[PDB]
Amino acid sequence: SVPWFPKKISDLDHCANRVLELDADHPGFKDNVYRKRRKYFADLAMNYKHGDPIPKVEFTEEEIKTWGTVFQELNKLYPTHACREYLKNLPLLSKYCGYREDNIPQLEDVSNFLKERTGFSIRPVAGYLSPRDFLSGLAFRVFHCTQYVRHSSDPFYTPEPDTCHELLGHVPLLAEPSFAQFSQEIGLASLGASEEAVQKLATCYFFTVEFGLCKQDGQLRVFGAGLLSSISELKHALSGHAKVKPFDPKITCKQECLITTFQDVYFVSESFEDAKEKMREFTKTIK
Numbered sequence: 001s002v003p004w005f006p007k008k009i010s011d012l013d014h015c016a017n018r019v020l021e022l023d024a025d026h027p028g029f030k031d032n033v034y035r036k037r038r039k040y041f042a043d044l045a046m047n048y049k050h051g052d053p054i055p056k057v058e059f060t061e062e063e064i065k066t067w068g069t070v071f072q073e074l075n076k077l078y079p080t081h082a083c084r085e086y087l088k089n090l091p092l093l094s095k096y097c098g099y100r101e102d103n104i105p106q107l108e109d110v111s112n113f114l115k116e117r118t119g120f121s122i123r124p125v126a127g128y129l130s131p132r133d134f135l136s137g138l139a140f141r142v143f144h145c146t147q148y149v150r151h152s153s154d155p156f157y158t159p160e161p162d163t164c165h166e167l168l169g170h171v172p173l174l175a176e177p178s179f180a181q182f183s184q185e186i187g188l189a190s191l192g193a194s195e196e197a198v199q200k201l202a203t204c205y206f207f208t209v210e211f212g213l214c215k216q217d218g219q220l221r222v223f224g225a226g227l228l229s230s231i232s233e234l235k236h237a238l239s240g241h242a243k244v245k246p247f248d249p250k251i252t253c254k255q256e257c258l259i260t261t262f263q264d265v266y267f268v269s270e271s272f273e274d275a276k277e278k279m280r281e282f283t284k285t286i287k
């Protein structure tokens with residue numbers, strides 16, 4: 001008995017809304033106005049259907065300032081920290097999608113850019129989905145993406161994904177063919193897979209797509225989106241203070257995914273091609 005899974009891109013309409021409303025420690029928890037703004041974003045995502053243009057948003061001066069603060073600091077770090085594929089694609093986004101300190105890019109523009117480059121596209125998502133449903137988007141080269149901005153009281157830290165994390169952390173690598181293929185194959189492996197297998201694929205995703213390191217020309221570089229949008233952990237990850245291990249799915253999938261602190265350990269992939277090969281070998285063992 002295989003569980004239901006999407007068979008075509010529009011089938012994500014039936015799981016994208018199955019969202020499993022701020023946590024007590026959220027910076028905007030007591031902010032009625034921010035709460036109202038978040039309801040606005042959540043409704044845009046809930047009402048979205050595949051085929052729609054993604055609704056364009058007029059961001060407030062406050063939201064744009066928060067983005068600018070994060071953008072400015074992270075861009076100082078990227079040349080010495082980010083992998084070559086990230087650095088190659090970031091300027092294309094400045095040119096074609098309006099990445100600037102004083103402008104938050106629109107998801108529809110970024111989606112059109114990705115569609116041309118690698119066939120990836122964006123779907124706005126209200127909030128957290130099951131790992132099964134989130135990974136199933138990747139099978140159709142769909143990235144479920146938050147559209148809201150973090151609270152302005154703390155521009156540097158966010159307990160959840162926001163659109164700064166999506167646009168600065170995830171998008172430049174989805175524009176890279178080798179990474180897009182790697183990501184899609186995680187989604188494909190997940191379709192109709194056992195609960196057990198889905199969880200293991202989710203953890204492998206976490207320690208590559210979200211917090212991965214890679215080796216390039218003998219150096220350690222960052223490709224994980226969660227690192228690329230966190231000023232403090234981006235620096236920490238390439239400091240001598242961090243614990244590092246080679247990416248190895250059978251080992252990596254045993255590691256706990258930390259959400260409110262720095263990771264205990266980071267995994268180093270040799271290349272996106274090699275990570276992809278290692279996942280192919282791994283998925284055979286859990287089908």
Ligand SMILES: CCCn1c(=O)[nH]c(=O)c2c1nc(Cc1nc3cc4c(cc3[nH]1)OCO4)n2Cc1ccccc1
Binds near residue numbers: 206210226
């Ligand atoms: C299968 C992987 C786990 N996983 C899941 O099971 N379901 C998801 O919906 C999911 C997810 N992962 C991410 C995307 C994501 N990026 C993150 C970056 C972070 C983070 C959490 C993140 N979740 O904390 C540290 O930095 N999402 C999208 C998401 C959207 C809105 C709120 C939370 C999460």
Ligand SMILES: [Fe+3]
Binds near residue numbers: 161165169170210226
């Ligand atoms: Fe993420």
